[PDB]
Amino acid sequence: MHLTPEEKSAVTALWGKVNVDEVGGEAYGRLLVVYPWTQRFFESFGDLSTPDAVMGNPKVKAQGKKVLGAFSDGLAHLDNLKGTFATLSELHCDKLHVDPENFRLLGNVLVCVLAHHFGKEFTPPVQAAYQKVVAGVANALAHKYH
């Protein structure tokens, strides 16, 4: 991943406007609605039967909060994504058995959610910066797979 200084600036500036819990719940719920095979890990989370049930499910939203909290913290480490996510990579491979393609689907949902939430502010160059970031995060989370 190679962010220009101005792309790093744009990422950081938009993110300062984000309610991480809110965006996390929206993005993770939309992941499960739009790409329902991602529900495979969440048989224990209760009602996933309709889009409204998924979006409103407390367990889904708690998962989104945890996931996007970790994503948020990683944005302080744009220079070292592989290192910052290495231990989560190993957990996702070794214990959680999560196909990294799920991370790429989440990245694209997150981009859509940022567009949805930010409107005018989510300009084509801001999107391009965030596309680099979500790709870099997914790549970092995939890095320790074996």
Next chain:
Amino acid sequence: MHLTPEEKSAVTALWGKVNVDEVGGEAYGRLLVVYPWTQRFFESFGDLSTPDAVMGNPKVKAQGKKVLGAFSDGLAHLDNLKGTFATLSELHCDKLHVDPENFRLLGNVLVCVLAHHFGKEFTPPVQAAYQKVVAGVANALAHKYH
């Protein structure tokens, strides 16, 4: 690119056995047969009407020889594929306008050709090593795109 020592040894051992011109003509012809939209870059190459015409076309074979010769030269530089392919990367972007997905298609076809030619000797771990390599070469060829 990081290769285990089993992987790099497997790549170099198999490659010393390869008839590069022959494999290059075979892989490049199969690229144009199996994924015929790749013919878009070869309007001037003459008859590409049927699989036998593509495979027997002297310009296709000459292109495959050039391409796989450059691939072969790069195998001496497995530790720095980005640097070894930077000039060709910029050429393919700026002059030839080649979508890098084409490099991935060619890598896949090359793996199939090596399996076809070596049979049982193209074992699952030798294939895995080659998959790493073709991915690394495609990534290196894509690196200078902008």
Next chain:
Amino acid sequence: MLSPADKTNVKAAWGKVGAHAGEYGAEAYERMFLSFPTTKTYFPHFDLSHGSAQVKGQGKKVADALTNAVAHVDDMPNALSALSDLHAHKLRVDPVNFKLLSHCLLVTLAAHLPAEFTPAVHASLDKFLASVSTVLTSKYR
């Protein structure tokens, strides 16, 4: 697979896009070229400047095709037949790129019509653009 509820959702959402369709088609390309630079390999001949006539023309044509597909969602192979021939035989755009444009159209719609871009509508639009893309690549080989 595209359901009749999906069909309803797409008709409603694209109907709401209305007269903005060409604008949004153009913006989807603009977004794609910046986010996914390799897609510019298919447009070495265009002025890709913001607001160019060539990008706006491409966006209007693509928007018209999408309008035709939305109006004919149970007969899309027929509706898009000329375009599936054009992409298979001449343009020869690698199928991977259709995913990239589709995503950029979703982003464009989310950015412009957030009230309409509900989770269900997002899912239906994604399925619909995947269907359109399948049709457009159906004659490639």
Next chain:
Amino acid sequence: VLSPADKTNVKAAWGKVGAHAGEYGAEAYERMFLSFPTTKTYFPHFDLSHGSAQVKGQGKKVADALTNAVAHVDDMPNALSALSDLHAHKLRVDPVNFKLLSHCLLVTLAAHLPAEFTPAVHASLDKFLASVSTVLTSKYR
């Protein structure tokens, strides 16, 4: 689209595979797990070492499904319906992985068919496996 020439090539190649289909299916999985380690995420309950009987069992099941698909090449959605349900609703294998297994089955076929894996047959087999994959992912959403 599966053309009569493609169907003919597929039937000829898979007829040649004959009774080795299960062995080749197992080898395709073995190749996939090594070349594309993320695919192992779907088999945490398996011994994935060379010669594993669990991999052999999986390869036999998939080979048999493919034999059935070949026998029903003109009626494939119905033939594969139970498997489409199973993959969509329970196994929930991300669609990208079907590409990976399809490539590894081509490699396996190539490694065992010096005469028969011609360029034309390679092309038809790739088309066929893409069609099987499309059917198997058609009910995911």
